Design an enzyme around this catalytic site. Structure first.
Site, short mmCIF file in Angstrom:
data_model
loop_
_atom_site.label_atom_id
_atom_site.label_comp_id
_atom_site.label_asym_id
_atom_site.label_seq_id
_atom_site.Cartn_x
_atom_site.Cartn_y
_atom_site.Cartn_z
N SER A 161 1.34 -3.43 3.84
CA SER A 161 1.67 -4.79 4.25
C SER A 161 1.07 -5.78 3.25
O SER A 161 0.20 -5.42 2.46
CB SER A 161 1.17 -5.08 5.67
OG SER A 161 -0.24 -5.09 5.72
N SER B 101 0.78 -1.24 0.00
CA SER B 101 0.00 0.00 0.00
C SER B 101 0.81 1.29 0.00
O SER B 101 0.22 2.37 -0.13
CB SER B 101 -1.00 0.02 1.15
OG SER B 101 -2.03 -0.92 0.90
N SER C 162 -6.04 3.56 4.17
CA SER C 162 -5.52 2.44 3.38
C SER C 162 -6.64 1.58 2.77
O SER C 162 -6.51 0.36 2.63
CB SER C 162 -4.53 1.61 4.21
OG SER C 162 -3.51 1.14 3.36
O1 LIG Z 1 -4.73 -6.42 0.75
C1 LIG Z 1 -3.95 -6.90 1.55
N1 LIG Z 1 -3.53 -6.26 2.65
C2 LIG Z 1 -3.85 -4.97 2.97
C3 LIG Z 1 -5.08 -4.39 2.65
C4 LIG Z 1 -5.36 -3.07 2.99
C5 LIG Z 1 -4.43 -2.30 3.68
C6 LIG Z 1 -3.21 -2.88 4.01
C7 LIG Z 1 -2.21 -2.08 4.75
N2 LIG Z 1 -1.22 -2.60 5.51
N3 LIG Z 1 -0.49 -1.55 6.05
N4 LIG Z 1 -1.08 -0.37 5.60
N5 LIG Z 1 -2.15 -0.73 4.79
C8 LIG Z 1 -2.91 -4.20 3.66
C9 LIG Z 1 -3.40 -8.28 1.28
C10 LIG Z 1 -2.79 -9.01 2.31
C11 LIG Z 1 -2.28 -10.28 2.05
C12 LIG Z 1 -2.36 -10.80 0.75
C13 LIG Z 1 -2.95 -10.07 -0.27
F1 LIG Z 1 -3.02 -10.57 -1.52
C14 LIG Z 1 -3.47 -8.81 0.00
#
Ligand SMILES: O=C(Nc1cccc(-c2nnn[nH]2)c1)c1cccc(F)c1
Ligand SMILES: O=C(Nc1cccc(-c2nnn[nH]2)c1)c1cccc(F)c1
Length: 259
Positions: free
Chosen positions: A209, A42, A102
């Site tokens: 992440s 992100s 996010s």
């Molecule tokens: O979309 C995912 N993660 C996600 C979604 C929204 C915000 C964030 C985030 N993490 N830190 N800031 N924003 C991470 C995701 C996680 C694991 C596998 C995948 F394919 C996607």
């Protein structure tokens, strides 16, 4: 000293750490795996929001443009967009939702406004970033598979770009101010870079992440001295590894104590 400390942190973490600091007082840089590729996750939302801000320089009403949110548009993390399903969000609301919360649905709408992931990459190239690449939409851009070049950049390139966007002339003055305001209003960042910085300092940041325990943060920091730009990327060898925001905080603390 700082290099050895970051190496020790990386070793104890079990993963792979990437750091780029730019000190705008004198253009000094500190790099650790500065030219290795990491999955952005992100943190890429900054480039998408910035590209829409660039479009708004020539369409002054663009940020007020409504965009339909349909049930089918919702993906895996939609804290803001879910409230507006069967309704609309403006491009300003989508930008703020992507950056500050996010929101993945919001990011997808920014990507679509730019003509797809390639449009985000095109904007990066236009401002002189030859490294950044966005290849996929949400949520798959966060798969973070080791060795996969999709949706990656290097710490050096992202620090340079974040500096140009927030402190330089990539954007018009109004747009630059808006981006900084959005970043300073981030809700997701207290445990990451900013956890390792003196409390008196002010900052804006964007976290990310994904799979492989990938845990990222990019920040612009205002300390008694000129602003700093800091990128901390972290990824691990197993697909289901836990996030490690503490590693980012530790890297930031090493950097801050080394200044
Ligand atoms: O979309 C995912 N993660 C996600 C979604 C929204 C915000 C964030 C985030 N993490 N830190 N800031 N924003 C991470 C995701 C996680 C694991 C596998 C995948 F394919 C996607
Ligand atoms: O590169 C892009 N825009 C851009 C870059 C640099 C300068 C300008 C510009 N706007 N008014 N004058 N120059 C626009 C761009 C924006 C959105 C999507 C895209 F694919 C590219």
């Amino acid at each position: 000293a700082v290099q050895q400390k970051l190496a020790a942190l990386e070793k104890s973490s079990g993963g792979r750490l990437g750091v780029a600091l730019i000190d705008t007082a004198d253009n000094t840089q500190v790099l650790y795996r500065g030219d290795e590729r990491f999955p952005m996750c992100s943190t890429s939302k900054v480039m998408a929001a910035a590209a829409v801000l660039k479009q708004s320089e020539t369409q002054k009403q663009l940020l007020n443009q409504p965009v339909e949110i349909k049930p089918a548009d919702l993906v895996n993390y939609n804290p803001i967009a879910e409230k507006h399903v069967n309704g609309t969000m403006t491009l300003a609301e989508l930008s703020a939702a992507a950056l500050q919360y996010s929101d993945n649905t919001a990011m997808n709408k920014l990507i679509a406004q730019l003509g797809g992931p390639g449009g985000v990459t095109a904007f990066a190239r236009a401002i002189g970033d030859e490294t950044f690449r966005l290849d996929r939409t949400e949520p798959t851009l966060n798969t973070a598979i080791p060795g996969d070049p999709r949706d990656t950049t290097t710490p050096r390139a992202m620090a340079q770009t974040l500096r140009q966007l927030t402190l330089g002339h990539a954007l018009g003055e109004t747009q630059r101010a808006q981006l900084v305001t959005w970043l300073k209003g981030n809700t997701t960042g207290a445990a990451s870079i900013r956890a390792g910085l003196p409390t008196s300092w002010t900052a804006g940041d964007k976290t990310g992440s994904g799979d492989y325990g990938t845990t990222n943060d990019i920040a612009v920091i205002w300390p008694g001295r000129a602003p700093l730009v800091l990128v901390t990327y972290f990824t691990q060898p197993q697909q289901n590894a836990e996030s490690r925001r503490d590693v980012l905080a530790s890297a930031a603390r090493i950097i801050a104590e080394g200044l």
